[PDB]
Amino acid sequence: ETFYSVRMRASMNKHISGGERLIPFHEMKHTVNALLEKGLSHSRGKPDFMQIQFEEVHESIKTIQPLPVHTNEVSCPEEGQKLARLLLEKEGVSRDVIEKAYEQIPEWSDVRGAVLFDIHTGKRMDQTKEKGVRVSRMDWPDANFEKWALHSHVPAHSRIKEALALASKVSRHPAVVAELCWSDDPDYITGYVAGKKMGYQRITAMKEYGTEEGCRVFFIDGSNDVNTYIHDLEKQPILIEWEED
């Protein structure tokens, strides 16, 4: 009944891969191996550095539902991004703060973690630079997740499970207005915008095949210092359990 946070990072020289898991002890070997195997064979390359790490969690665990999901079919990245910018505005980010974020996204391609963007300053809020803010201690039991996929008619890919767990944890934070995300994997072009009102909005094309610039940005409207928020994001333990209605 004690849970452990289990984290993996892998890189070349370029970031490669990562994983966050939240598990009971008896699943340690299976989890550590799954994270290992995940790091070794990624399409961004085989890594020359990897770290795997576990710690007992002392905070109590909150179980939540996943964000509601809707999938937007688009014909091209440019259409995808336009729709994304529209949905961020719909969720409450001002056009002008959106534009400033997009001016910076190319420079964030190297950040190994999430970027926090303050809607009050129109500027990046966190001071982690290339490290990025790390969202952790969230997970989604597979069996529950596969039932969710079957009902939702969405493919039971672990990377959707991971992304929707992160997005659901993150959107629950009262200071987070929206998240904008697409992959750094050259072979996966689907991304999303996520928010409290629109839920998890998948957008089937957010970049071209073969490009490696991805993005993850949280738009922050809060009254607290950024370190508090960084601490919430790292420390609040979250499990996703879906229940049909």
Ligand X SMILES: O=C(O)CCCCCC(=O)O
Interface positions with ligand X (CB under 6 A):
159-160, 163, 181, 183-185, 188, 190-192, 202, 214
Which residue number, 4 or 188, has a Cβ lying nearer to ligand X? 188
Which residue number, 139 or 184, has a Cβ lying nearer to ligand X? 184
CB of 106 to ligand X, least distance (A): 17
CB distance 191 to 211 below 8 Å: no
CB of 204 to ligand X, least distance (A): 8
Q: How far apart are CA 131 and CA 146, in angstroms?
A: 32
Which residue blocks in 92-141 are alpha helix, DSSP H?
95-104
Q: How far apart are CA 156 and CA 199, in angstroms?
A: 19
Which residue number, 137 or 202, has a Cβ lying nearer to ligand X? 202
CB of 192 to ligand X, least distance (A): 5
CB of 167 to ligand X, least distance (A): 8
Q: Which residue is nearest to ligand X (CB)?
A: 183
Which residue number, 214 or 222, has a Cβ lying nearer to ligand X? 214
Q: How many CA atoms lie within 13 A of 17 on its CB side?
A: 23
Q: How far apart are CA 181 and CA 189, in angstroms?
A: 11
Q: How far apart are CA 34 and CA 29, in angstroms?
A: 9
